[PDB]
């Protein structure tokens, strides 16, 4: 009944287990809604997409985690219900937590015989891992295609008439693969900008699995292209002499525009994959369709984070440096005074990566403390339930320590209940006492997060409240802000704001030896979150927020942590804490005068987007770029409103803006329908992770869900003006010298001896021609002595889109023996019909 909504090449399920899931098993479904259970035969439908029972249905993709021995289920009640001998709860019942939204937590659990339980658990665990990996993919167009086809199938396959409208064009059953190809013909033959970019370099001629990448038979190709031409209207690119790109034109493109430097074999490999027409591949070329595919590939999207992973080499510094994701009033779902409080939501915080949470403990109604917003209509919850629901899902994603903040409104005997509950549920996980030798020294410093992997910490008051609870707190003492390392304070929004305004340097230095959290203000009753950037600048680590509001600050917080895998410990800028920095303690972001610093220029070029009005065919898209950051660099922009186009708007406008602090800025690209002012897509991204040269940008909807089809084609260029005589660049002022040394460059040198026309060289910043030349010739000892008749010559050719204009001659210039290469490389601007190359000639 169609394809696999989870493709086979994604799973890792062994044949026996997958076959068992498909065949099914004998299980007892447990209902907690009405305290009922029944005997049912579970199954996994043909497509790895559902779990039917009989009568019912559940969609797997909505799953978020699976648990064994979930205390929510009463084992004894089940045993009595179906008269089965005592069954070990810890290993006889498994749980599903499926929800459509970021708040819904509706469970599904079964209790089955021993091995049946083992099979179902070990199966749905891998299915859940598959789903979690799928939702983290950079490119997901194929997934969208699968969903669309399957949905259209119900009970007939999509018709060409409908497939046309689906992609936005004006009764034969269509195969899925054919369907797929059709989409390709709307992702290449509907990008005029792509062709106009291609005709600047063309000359005349004639992690994620690879298979998933949509664009990575001949007769069908042509029919699909022809049908694409008829349907499209504008910017459409509808046998004689046709151009192409060689192993040298592409190398020019990469050395000059993008910035990538690829050696020969690498570039040949890169050309091998993309070319659709097999005929043109052998000659060593890349036909227009080939260029289109090369640009839209998953190795070309804007950010550096979409394919990131933990950098274990930076999490080894003390705990007082890294930022830390956090939440506020974890249990809450709605207002601060009228709403519910769902325990299961405590997982949404930890699963998404957060490493901090709050406990509003209150005296129990029967001796067991409960959690409720103080003196309101908010419902209550069992404290032990929450404590356990944290433990089970504490370390699914990350393996780095998490800190729980404790608020006490309980009685001392009932606080001892909490003490014992923690000592039981967590046991050794909870840090009990001092751990490391460095702690027992005259100058203690916080241990690094890695040394405490999968641990847990408690923030609360510490005695110099019952002694039992207090003795559990060693590293996070809550002493009201006036050894010092363990004293962590908490400040209300406004208090911290005024502290910053009245004091920059002192507060910042304070953040260099302790933690200091922050939470929204009391006046909020609908949870309008604060813009944390004012706080992040000075070094406030734990900026707690509310995880149920679809608003800008939340997306800012989310994007801030995509880096370093998502483990939520991103090193703070070295300027604040690295003593070796030349601006250490002398940088107050609340200031507005930086005469001793050189701002760097950025040229952003919003070329054109594609399909940036989801479910809105007719409209007037505009793009709002906005540089959130320090008070001195805030600036927004825009482009002209397009008319009745959403498949491929072409604004093609350039914003030039200078910025001062590279490390800590963010961009907020946002579609805006320019007739209702209702943002219909957006995408944030830090400015230290935007790849230069032409790139692609993947958008999102308001909820921060990923939209696949919508995308913006942009070009960024980072220009740094020469540090002429007196002042060092801001980039050099803010950081140390270690980064520049570690930031070595590639240089593509032509004419290197050998068969290959060009041979990359890796060179540091302080590299001149002489050593570079030695690198050209140091390979071989055959030469008796260094012959000076090998001089680099900064060659530069001339061509622009108007091929048929002049075809001027190539400029040339001797290379100064004492000239820095890095400046030469940074001095090439492919804007005037320019492509630099550095060639060795005698």
């Amino acid at each position, epitope marked *: 009944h169609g394809t696999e909504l989870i493709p086979w090449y994604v799973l890792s399920i062994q044949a026996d287990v997958h076959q068992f899931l498909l065949q099914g098993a004998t299980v007892i479904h447990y209902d907690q809604d009405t305290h009922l259970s029944a005997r049912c035969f579970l199954q996994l439908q043909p497509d790895n997409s559902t779990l039917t029972w009989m009568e019912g249905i559940l969609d797997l993709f909505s799953v978020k985690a699976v648990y064994m021995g979930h205390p929510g289920i009463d084992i004894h009640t089940v045993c009595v219900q179906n008269k089965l001998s005592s069954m070990l709860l810890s290993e006889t019942g498994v749980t599903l937590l499926y929800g459509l939204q970021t708040t819904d937590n509706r469970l599904l659990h079964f209790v089955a015989p021993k091995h049946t339980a083992k099979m179902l658990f070990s199966g749905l665990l891998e299915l859940t891992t598959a789903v979690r990996k799928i939702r983290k993919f950079p490119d997901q167009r194929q997934q969208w295609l699968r969903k669309q086809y399957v949905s259209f199938y119900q009970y007939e396959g999509p018709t060409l008439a409908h497939a046309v409208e689906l992609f936005g064009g004006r009764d034969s059953n269509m195969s899925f693969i054919e369907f797929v190809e059709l989409f390709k013909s709307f992702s290449i033959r509907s990008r005029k900008d792509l062709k106009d970019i291609f005709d600047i370099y063309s000359v005349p001629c004639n992690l994620q699995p690879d298979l998933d990448l949509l664009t990575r038979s001949d007769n069908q190709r042509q029919i699909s292209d022809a049908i694409a031409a008829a349907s499209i209207v504008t910017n459409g690119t509808g046998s004689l*002499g*046709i151009f192409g790109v*060689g192993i040298l034109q592409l190398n020019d493109f990469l050395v000059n525009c993008q910035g990538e430097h690829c050696t020969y074999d690498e570039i040949l490999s890169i050309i091998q994959k993309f070319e659709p027409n097999i005929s043109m591949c052998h*000659q*060593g070329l890349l036909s227009f369709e080939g260029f289109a595919r090369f640009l839209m590939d998953k190795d070309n999207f804007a950010s550096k984070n979409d394919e990131s992973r933990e950098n274990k080499k930076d999490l080894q510094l003390p705990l007082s440096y890294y930022y830390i994701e956090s939440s506020h009033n974890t249990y809450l779902t709605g207002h601060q005074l009228k709403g519910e409080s769902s325990v299961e939501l405590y997982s949404q915080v930890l699963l998404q990566g957060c490493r901090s949470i709050e406990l509003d403990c209150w005296d129990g109604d029967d001796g067991m403390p409960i959690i409720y917003h103080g003196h309101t209509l908010t419902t209550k919850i069992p404290f032990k339930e929450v404590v356990e629901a944290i433990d089970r899902s504490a370390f699914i994603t990350s393996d780095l320590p998490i800190i729980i903040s404790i608020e006490n409104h309980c009685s001392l005997p009932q606080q001892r209940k909490m003490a014992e509950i923690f000592k039981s549920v967590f046991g050794e996980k909870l840090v009990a006492k001092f751990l490391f030798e460095t702690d027992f020294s005259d100058d203690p410093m916080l241990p690094s997060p890695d040394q405490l992997r999968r641990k847990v910490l408690l923030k609360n008051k510490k005695l110099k409240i019952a002694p039992e609870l207090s003795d559990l707190v060693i590293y996070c003492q809550a002493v009201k802000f006036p050894p010092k390392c363990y004293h962590i304070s908490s400040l209300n929004e406004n208090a911290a704001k005024r502290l910053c305004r009245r004091y920059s340097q002192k507060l910042i230095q304070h953040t260099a030896c302790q933690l200091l959290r922050t939470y929204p203000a009391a006046t909020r009753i609908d949870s309008s979150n604060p813009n944390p950037l004012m706080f992040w600048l000075h070094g406030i680590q734990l900026v707690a927020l509310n995880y149920q509001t679809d608003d800008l600050p939340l997306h800012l917080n989310a994007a801030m942590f995509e880096a370093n895998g998502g483990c939520g410990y991103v090193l703070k800028p070295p300027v604040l804490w690295d003593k070796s920095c030349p601006m250490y303690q002398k940088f107050s972001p609340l200031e507005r005068d930086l005469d001793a610093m050189d701002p760097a220029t950025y040229s952003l070029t919003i070329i054109s987007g594609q399909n940036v009005c989801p479910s809105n065919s007719t409209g007037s898209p505009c793009i709002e770029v906005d540089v959130l950051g320090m008070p001195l660099d805030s600036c927004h922009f825009r482009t002209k409103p397009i008319h009745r186009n959403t498949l491929n708007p072409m604004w093609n406008e350039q914003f030039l803006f200078r910025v001062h602090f590279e490390d800590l800025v963010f961009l907020r690209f946002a579609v805006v329908e320019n007739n209702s002012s209702a943002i219909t897509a957006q995408r944030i991204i830090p400015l230290k992770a935007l790849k230069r040269g032409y790139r692609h940008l993947q958008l999102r909807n308001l909820h921060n869900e990923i939209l696949e089809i919508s995308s913006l084609f942009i070009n960024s260029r980072r220009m740094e003006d020469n540090p002429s005589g007196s002042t060092r660049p801001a980039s050099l002022m803010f950081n140390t010298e270690e980064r520049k040394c570690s930031q070595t460059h590639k240089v593509t040198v032509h004419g290197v001896p050998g068969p290959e026309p060009f041979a990359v060289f890796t060179i540091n910043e302080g590299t001149k021609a002489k050593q570079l030349l030695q690198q050209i010739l140091a390979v071989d000892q055959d030469t008796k002595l260094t012959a000076a008749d090998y001089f680099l010559m900064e060659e530069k050719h001339f061509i622009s889109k108007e091929k048929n204009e002049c075809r001027k001659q190539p400029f040339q210039r001797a290379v100064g023996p004492e000239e820095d290469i890095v400046q030469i490389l940074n001095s090439w601007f492919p804007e005037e019909g320019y492509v630099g190359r550095i060639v060795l000639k005698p």
Partner: antibody
């Protein structure tokens, strides 16, 4: 100012292999198409091949495909027409000449045609006697 | 592709008009020239497309006919004349025609 020196022709038995080079200068070889055209004595003119240099795409005639191999070296600004298993009718004069293209792009992509054979080399003779 | 260079040869008195017929098997747009070669030397160019540069040479076309016209014949004009086109990349030549003096 354009100079096209072609050398390497001569005599060789049937079935022999041979190559004719054509040095150039003045005009940027990297942006110009090189050629070879031959003339058996007392007969018309015959086109040999066409190598677009940087592009690499090559186009031989419909009479001697194969045994004639065409290559180029943009770095050295030379060309190389490698001939394999020479036959009797290889006995003729070999001429190397550049050319240029006149792009004629239409409502769509761009197109390119050879326009003007505006130079020729001095001339070299290849003979095959058995 | 095909080319024609009729007539193959002729003889004329100095100062007269010379006309050469070079017809193609099919329309080849405007890719036709006229190359001259004195014996013992590499040929040379005269014309690309229609005319364009020799002071009395010209070229005009009619349907599928490409013509070279010399307004006034000159003595040194004794040489061979070729017509060659270029479809996409296929250098084809005419039969070649020879011009001399008559007595």
């Amino acid at each position: 100012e354009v100079q096209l020196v072609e050398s390497g022709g001569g005599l060789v038995q049937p079935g022999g292999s041979l190559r004719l080079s054509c040095a150039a200068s003045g005009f940027n070889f990297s942006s110009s198409s090189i050629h070879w055209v031959r003339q058996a004595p007392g007969k018309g003119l015959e086109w040999v091949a066409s190598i677009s240099s940087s592009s690499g795409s090559t186009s031989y005639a419909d009479s001697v495909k194969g045994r004639f191999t065409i290559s180029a070296d943009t770095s050295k600004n030379t060309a190389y027409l490698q001939m394999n298993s020479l036959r009797a009718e290889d006995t003729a004069v070999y001429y190397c000449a550049r050319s240029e293209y006149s792009y004629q792009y239409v409502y769509g992509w761009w197109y390119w045609n050879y326009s003007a054979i505006d130079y020729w080399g001095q001339g070299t003779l290849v003979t095959v006697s058995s | 592709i095909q080319m024609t260079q009729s007539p193959s040869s002729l003889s004329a008195s100095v100062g007269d008009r010379v006309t050469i017929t070079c017809r193609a098997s099919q329309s080849v747009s405007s890719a036709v020239a006229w190359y001259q070669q004195k014996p013992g030397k590499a040929p040379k160019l005269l014309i690309y497309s229609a005319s364009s540069l020799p002071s009395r040479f010209s070229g005009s076309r009619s349907g599928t006919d490409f013509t070279l016209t010399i307004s006034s014949l000159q003595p040194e004009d004794f040489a061979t004349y070729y017509c060659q086109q270029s479809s996409s990349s296929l250098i084809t030549f005419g039969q070649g025609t020879k011009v001399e003096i008559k007595r």
